[PDB]
Amino acid sequence: DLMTALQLVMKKSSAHDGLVKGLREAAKAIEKHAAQICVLAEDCDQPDYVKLVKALCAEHNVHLVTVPSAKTLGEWAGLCKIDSEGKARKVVGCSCVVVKDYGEDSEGLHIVQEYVKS
RNA sequence: GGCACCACCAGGCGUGGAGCCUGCGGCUUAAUUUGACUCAACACGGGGAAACUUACCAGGUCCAGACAUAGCAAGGAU
Ligand SMILES: [K+]
Ligand SMILES: [K+]
Ligand SMILES: [Mg+2]
Ligand SMILES: [Mg+2]
Ligand SMILES: [Mg+2]
Ligand SMILES: [Mg+2]
Numbered sequence: 001d002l003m004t005a006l007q008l009v010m011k012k013s014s015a016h017d018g019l020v021k022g023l024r025e026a027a028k029a030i031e032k033h034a035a036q037i038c039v040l041a042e043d044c045d046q047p048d049y050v051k052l053v054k055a056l057c058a059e060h061n062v063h064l065v066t067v068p069s070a071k072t073l074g075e076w077a078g079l080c081k082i083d084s085e086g087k088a089r090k091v092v093g094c095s096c097v098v099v100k101d102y103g104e105d106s107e108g109l110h111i112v113q114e115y116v117k118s
Numbered sequence: 119g120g121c122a123c124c125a126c127c128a129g130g131c132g133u134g135g136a137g138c139c140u141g142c143g144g145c146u147u148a149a150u151u152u153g154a155c156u157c158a159a160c161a162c163g164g165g166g167a168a169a170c171u172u173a174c175c176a177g178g179u180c181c182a183g184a185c186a187u188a189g190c191a192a193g194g195a196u
Contacts, residue, residue, distance in 0.1 A: 015189095022192030046193070079192070092191060 004067075006112040007076040010039070013103030014078045020098040023049065023076050025055055029098035035062040037099040038115065041070030044095045053096060063116050072097050112116075 013019055020029035029035045038057050044050060056066050067073060073094040074080060080089035102109065 020192095022194065022196070025192070044193075049193070074192085077192085092187085092194095094192060095194080 002111055003065075003113055006083065006108045006115075009103055009105070009107065009109040009112055012077055012101075012105035012107075013099050015103075016101075016103045016105070018099060018101035018103065019077050020100045021079065021094055021096065023053060023096050026053060026096035026098045029100045030056045030060050030062070032062070032100075034100040034104045035060065035098045037063045039065045039067050039073060039097045039099075039110075041057060041073040041093075041095045042066060042068060043070040043093075049095065057066060065112075065115075073097065 010019065016072075020035075024072060026035075026038065030038075032114050035057075038053070040050065040053060042050070054064065071094040073092050074091045075087075075096040077088065077094050079092040083089050
């Protein structure tokens with residue numbers, strides 16, 4: 001009902017557009033004062049990656065959600081083809097999905113917004 | 119046996135001779151793009167081309183290769 005189940009709000013955000021995926025863009029999505037959430041994937045090897053993104057998110061004030069399995073981070077962020085119902089997706093691995101603008105369908109967003117508050 | 123000035127007769131104006139214009143052949147050319155050769159090809163392609171036309175020659179670009187499949191890929195395909 002929270003955290004993991006809140007991939008749906010980001011489904012709606014991807015539908016309505018607003019997922020600024022990837023670090024190169026993540027940063028830009030931040031400094032452009034348009035970042036709202038910043039799911040991350042601890043699977044990333046390069047420590048400077050996580051240090052730098054946390055530094056940028058600390059510079060502004062938006063949010064940081066951690067989630068494991070960067071492959072699943074690619075899955076949630078649309079970094080894949082829907083394929084069949086079983087979804088044999090050749091998934092691309094993501095490590096930052098800035099929800100610039102954010103899906104405006106609300107719902108779980110409010111609940112994750114609570115987790116966002118804390 | 120007929121018919122017809124795209125035949126002749128009686129003629130008129132001509133062309134064929136000259137200069138030039140233009141089309142065709144040939145030659146030359148990097149290419150001198152090419153179709154058409156008795157009437158029924160040859161100022162014909164409505165073709166009087168500076169560029170475009172343009173099909174030719176010498177070069178330079180670009181993809182305006184949908185779609186399907188498989189890969190590469192947000193630590194970036196492009
Ligand atoms: K004459
Ligand atoms: K003629
Ligand atoms: Mg006569
Ligand atoms: Mg003459
Ligand atoms: Mg020309
Ligand atoms: Mg030319």
